[model samples]
Target: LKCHNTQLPFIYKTCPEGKNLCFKATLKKFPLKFPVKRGCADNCPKNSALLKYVCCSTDKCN
Candidate 1:
């Protein structure tokens, strides 16, 4: 699936013909310019601690 892959030179790309869900991780602490990380995950786990995450299932839905 295609998701919004976030990182250096952020770009929207497709996952390696695998996972069907997209995920976005966010920092629960202070904050940064951008406290969210986006990508594709087969298992979109939401372990809330220093960071939390949200998952979706759609094109570019990260």
Candidate 2:
């Protein structure tokens, strides 16, 4: 599946599903500057870290 317009590997998952590192790594390359001040407040993995705009399934990078 693709993410933020970037086509991910066949095995790669989509947002709100992929791991923090994989998701963040792909999202970081995006052109638009995501809101950093905002905090994660969505359906993230249990015990996952939070972030601005999107939550993480591990860390707050995404």
Candidate 3:
């Protein structure tokens, strides 16, 4: 499986089933920089900072 992440610059990697493709972005404002991540489950931290996450479950989809 494969997925896409908005955290990095055009990042793409493999993702197994049952695992979520995670992406985190700061909610401060636009034109701002934030950390982005993509991979299996639990890729995003539970408590770290003010941020938003979008997850999707699919085979080779992101």
Quote the positional error of residue 17 for candidate 2 in Å.
21
Q: List lDDT for all candidates, in order.
A: 0.74, 0.33, 0.52
**Cα-based RMSD of the predictions, in order?**
2.5, 10.3, 4.4
Candidate 3 structure quality by residue, lDDT tens digits, 1-62:
56665525666676556555544334534566554444555455463465555555564343
- Error (Å) of candidate 2 at residue 23 is 11
Candidate 3 matches the true fold with a TM-score of 0.41
Q: Report the poorest 10 consecutive residues by lDDT, candidate 1.
A: 27-36
Query: What stretches of model 3 exceed 4 Å from their correct place?
Result: 6-11, 16-24, 27-35, 42-49, 59-62
Say which prediction, candidate 1 or candidate 2, comes out ahead on lDDT: 1
Q: Which pairs clash (backbone N, Cα, C closer than 3 Å) in model 2?
A: 40-51
Q: Which candidate tops lDDT?
A: 1
The residue pairs in collision within model 1 are none
- lDDT of each residue in 31-60, candidate 2, tens digit only: 674433222234443332433233444333
| Candidate 1: residue 30 lDDT (0-100) | 70
Worst 10 residues of 2 by lDDT: 18-27
Query: What order do you get sorting by TM-score, best first?
Result: 1, 3, 2
lDDT (10s digit) by residue, model 1, range 1-62: 67677656666778876788888887765745356677887777775767778788887776
